[PDB]
């Protein structure tokens, strides 16, 4: 979604430093408001201490800052943050791999639903659309980016993802629960009807198509599960309390105290707490990692591109089962027909990558 | 890719020490430039303090160094680095196991696509090439090492991985998305056509070949996913900010202060911060682990050898379905035909490894 994969392909001098200059989906963009509020509260307190407090009040503030500073300890924050963010990242990738792709069903429907006639074409196209509909229905239930594009079931119809008859049949089935599973049932019935009409040879080929359907259903279920079962609220609150406890301590504890009073640890007054602000970006930015990935189907820069996926799948799906049904290129003899040990060429820049075969660690390299 | 597996086979005296003398894919090669910049910035600051600053300025620098040194804390860096590098290492191995291997399809196509005639040969060879093409297409999309070898679809054709007719059919199919999935559809269609021509006996055998194809498609999808879905940028920036914050503190904090002033902790002046430089190799090298494996398909020393894999797969693939179709050695009686409990020999060096059968922990060893 914010892909920088090609920038970090090699481990060169500025592989990671270069990324500090990027704004899209960056730490600056996510921390902006929070950082400013921190900056303000800090320098506000700083001026109150330098310009308002009396000599006697300043002595109390200095004693209060020493108290607060002794409680700004990251080690407990690092512990709970690391674990929580690890949990979020785990679910984040699991949710991605749970986005259903048509390609596996697409391959079977394209080759095993017979007929080069309009009905065979309508049959194959309708089967794929039942798959894409099972997906679009669940995606608009879990993704705010998709829902805002299909806010009502009418949008789904007008977008060409569901026919008005299907919508009628959809409404006809009375159920109080999410009907995303309906197209998945239609598919199995239509696949069986297709087999009875002789469009699907065996039951082995039919069950094979039914299996890939069931797999797609399990994908939609996983998406439903992660949307329904949030990370327990108590856990989320714990990590924000811990993080905020730290920044609360820093607000006062990290104040630059009087250099003249010579407090151990506060010998220099820089006015601006460089390292405390660097700690804020670290921990507030670290919390923002979880903050952004806790729901990867939202509208964040790094949230999944669910609407593009829908478009790509629609185009590719139909194309593979229609224009490509039993449509192959001209079979030719391959360029290595009479060559048992082909030696495919290398460009000038890639010849260093033509390596001898790795036989095993145990063998002597001679 | 940089395999030292045989060197670390045994846990001897210098099993790991020996590896500190290796340059290829080493910590020295990856840290070289960064270390020099650190070295320079350090000793530059060191000379400014020893030779330029006035007695009064030196006192401020010493107070500034005590401030910076109090913020060079590795514990928070260790937390975020360990977690981040673990995530990178996790994806690193997942991407490797996502590199498709022909061997499973290779075994089925070689034995279940009938015919010892030129067509049967062309059929089997074309089926394998559709698999290898599905792979090469995705590999050149995710690997810079491969792309620089196949920068254009013409390179793929001229290299013998795609026929010009296939390229024509390829172009004929209008789609704005990556067509790496095309050969995977052709395969299923060609496998079905082969079955209708009587070259594949049952549908059980056909579905079995279609399944191994779908698995290969899922492999290509995983590669696409890891290339598309980068580790969230904010997370990457967080760990570089944390690491750099530490080295910023060390640049000044780890300066050798005046021994005469007798600062607690700074009683000895060695001019060269041995342990601080050793800490740099540790953390900068630890960050380089993630820096190198975050994209294992690049051109790093330890990045995957994707071009060799392509070559090996091409050679082995065709060879197994052509020269090896229904081609077996002469069936003989095995050397242990009349021996129910064979006792295979051992070399002189390996006799210590002939052990009695492990029956279970519960049994008395007598």
């Amino acid at each position, epitope marked *: 979604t914010v892909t920088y994969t090609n920038r970090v392909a090699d481990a060169r001098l500025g592989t990671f430093s270069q990324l500090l200059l990027q704004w899209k989906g960056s730490i600056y963009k996510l921390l902006y408001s929070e950082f400013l509020i921190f900056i303000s509260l800090y320098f506000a307190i700083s001026l109150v201490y330098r310009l308002i407090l009396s000599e006697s009040q300043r002595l109390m503030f200095e004693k209060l800052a020493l108290y607060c500073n002794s409680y700004a300890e990251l080690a407990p924050v690092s512990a709970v943050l690391g674990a929580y963010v690890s949990l979020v990242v785990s679910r984040w990738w699991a949710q991605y791999e749970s986005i259903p792709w048509p390609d596996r069903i697409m391959n079977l429907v394209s080759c095993n639903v017979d007929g080069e006639d309009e009905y065979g074409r309508l049959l194959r196209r309708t089967l794929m659309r039942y798959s894409n509909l099972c997906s679009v229905l669940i995606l608009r239930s879990v993704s705010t980016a998709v829902y805002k594009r299909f806010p009502s079931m009418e949008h789904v119809v007008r977008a060409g993802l569901m026919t008005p008859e299907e919508h009628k049949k959809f409404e006809s089935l009375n159920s109080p629960h999410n009907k995303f599973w309906i197209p998945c049932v239609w598919f199995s019935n239509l696949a069986v009807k297709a087999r009875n009409e002789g469009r699907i040879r065996d039951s082995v080929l039919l069950q094979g198509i039914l299996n890939e359907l069931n797999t797609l259903r399990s994908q939609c279920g996983r998406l439903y599960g992660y949307d329904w079962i949030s990370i327990p609220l108590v856990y989320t609150q714990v990590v924000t309390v811990a993080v905020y406890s730290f920044f609360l301590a820093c607000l006062i504890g990290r104040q630059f105290l009087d250099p003249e009073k010579a407090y151990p640890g506060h010998e220099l007054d820089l006015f601006v707490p460089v390292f405390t602000f660097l700690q804020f970006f670290f921990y507030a930015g670290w919390l923002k990692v979880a903050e952004q990935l806790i729901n990867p189907f939202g509208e964040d820069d790094d949230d999944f591109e669910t609407n593009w996926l829908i478009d790509r799948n629609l185009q590719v799906s139909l194309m593979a089962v229609d224009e490509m049904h039993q449509d192959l290129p001209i079979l030719e003899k391959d360029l290595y027909w009479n060559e048992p040990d082909p*030696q495919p*060429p*290398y*460009t*000038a*820049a890639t*010849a*260093e990558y*033509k390596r001898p075969s790795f036989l095993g660690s145990t063998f002597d390299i001679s | 890719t940089v395999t030292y597996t045989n060197r670390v086979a045994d846990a001897r005296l210098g099993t790991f020490s020996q590896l500190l003398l290796q340059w290829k894919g080493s910590i020295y090669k990856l840290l070289y430039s960064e270390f020099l910049i650190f070295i320079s910035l350090y000793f530059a600051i060191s000379l400014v303090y020893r030779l330029i600053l006035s007695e009064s300025q030196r006192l401020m620098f010493e107070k500034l160094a005590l401030y910076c040194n109090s913020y060079a804390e590795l514990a928070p860096v260790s937390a975020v680095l360990g977690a981040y590098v673990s995530l990178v290492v996790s994806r690193w191995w997942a991407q490797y196991e996502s590199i498709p291997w022909p061997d499973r399809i290779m075994n089925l196509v070689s034995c279940n696509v009938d015919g010892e005639d030129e067509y049967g040969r062309l059929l089997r060879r074309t089926l394998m090439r559709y698999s290898n093409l599905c792979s090469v297409l995705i590999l050149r999309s995710v690997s810079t090492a491969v792309y*620089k070898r196949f*920068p*254009s679809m*013409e*390179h793929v054709v*001229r*290299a013998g991985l795609m026929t010009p007719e296939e390229h024509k059919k390829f172009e004929s199919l209008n789609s704005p998305h990556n067509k790496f999935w095309i050969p995977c559809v052709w395969f299923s269609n060609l496998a079905v056509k082969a079955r209708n021509e009587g070259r594949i006996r049952d549908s059980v055998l056909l579905q079995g070949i279609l399944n191994e194809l779908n698995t290969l498609r899922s492999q290509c999808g995983r590669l696409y996913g890891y290339d598309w879905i980068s580790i969230p940028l904010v997370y990457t920036q967080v760990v570089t900010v944390a690491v750099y914050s530490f080295f910023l503190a060390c640049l000044i904090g780890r300066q050798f202060l005046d021994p005469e002033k007798a600062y607690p902790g700074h009683e000895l002046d060695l001019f060269v911060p041995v342990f601080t430089f050793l800490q740099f190799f540790f953390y900068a090298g630890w960050l380089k682990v993630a820096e190198q494996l975050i994209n294992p398909f690049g051109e790093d020393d330890d990045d995957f050898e994707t071009n060799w894999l392509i070559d090996r797969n091409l050679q082995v693939s065709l060879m197994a379905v052509d020269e090896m179709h229904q081609d077996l050695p002469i069936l003989e009686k095995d050397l242990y035909w009349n021996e129910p409990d064979p006792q295979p020999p051992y070399t002189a060096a390996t006799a210590e490894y002939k052990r009695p059968s492990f029956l279970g922990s519960t049994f008395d060893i007598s």
Partner: antibody
Framework: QVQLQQSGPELVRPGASVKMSCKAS????????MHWVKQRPGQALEWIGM????????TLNQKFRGKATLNVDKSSNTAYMQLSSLTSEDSAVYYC?????????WGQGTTLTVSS | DIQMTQSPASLSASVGETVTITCRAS??????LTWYQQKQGKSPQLLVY???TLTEGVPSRFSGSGSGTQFSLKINSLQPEDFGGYFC?????????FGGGTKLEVKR
């Protein structure tokens, strides 16, 4: 049709610098590496270097390390080569070729003459 | 670097004849060799690539062979056009050094 149209012939005084062009057309500029070859009468063709149009990664010949410079303009689909500290020996015919495991398309050539 | 040694420096033959140019590699370059034809004043043209494969326009009378360190171009049944310059180039790595060349002149 693939066509590599280089700049016209050039004449410069020793010590100066020159920058010749090569405009490609009829194929995707960024998908093929661009090479530069030097042709002197009586000597064999010398490989100067190559350039990756996409990322402008250059790979020169050690023999031309300080003499040649490569860069491209993806927008205008043209490649450039700059020769510095020109001497009488830098006088020759300079080609730009497209690579596809081979040099299948060359330019007409740019004749460089260095004299006072 | 890989050294390309071409021979003969110049061959003289008349129409109808069959000549054979030879390029020898300093080290193993597998099948990574190309043959170019260059007529005085014009820019070179690709004849054979990948050691054996003929390019588009090249007539059947041209054929290449060899592998490893020994390659050869063979022009059977010469023509008037076939008279001019001929050189080879290896394509295994960087820099892709060229051959010395061969001047194919008419014999009278």
């Amino acid at each position: 049709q693939v066509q590599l149209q280089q700049s016209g012939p050039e004449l410069v005084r020793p010590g100066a610098s020159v920058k010749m062009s090569c405009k490609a057309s009829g194929y995707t500029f960024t998908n093929y590496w661009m090479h530069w070859v030097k042709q002197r009468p009586g000597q064999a063709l010398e490989w100067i270097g190559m350039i990756d149009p996409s990322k402008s990664e250059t790979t020169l010949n050690q023999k031309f390390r300080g003499k040649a410079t490569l860069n491209v303009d993806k927008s205008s689909n043209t490649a450039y080569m700059q020769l510095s500290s020109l001497t009488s020996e830098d006088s020759a015919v300079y080609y730009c070729a497209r690579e596809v495991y081979y040099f299948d398309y060359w330019g007409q050539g740019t004749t460089l003459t260095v004299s006072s | 670097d890989i050294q390309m040694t071409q021979s003969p420096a110049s061959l003289s033959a008349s129409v109808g004849e069959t000549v054979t140019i030879t390029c020898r590699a300093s080290e193993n370059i597998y099948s990574y060799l190309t043959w170019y034809q260059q007529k005085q004043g014009k820019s070179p043209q690709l004849l054979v690539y990948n050691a054996k494969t003929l390019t588009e326009g090249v007539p059947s009378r041209f054929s290449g062979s060899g592998s490893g360190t020994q390659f050869s171009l063979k022009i059977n049944s010469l023509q008037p056009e076939d008279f001019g310059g001929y050189f080879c180039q290896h394509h295994y790595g960087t820099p892709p050094t060229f051959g010395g060349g061969t001047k194919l002149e008419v014999k009278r």
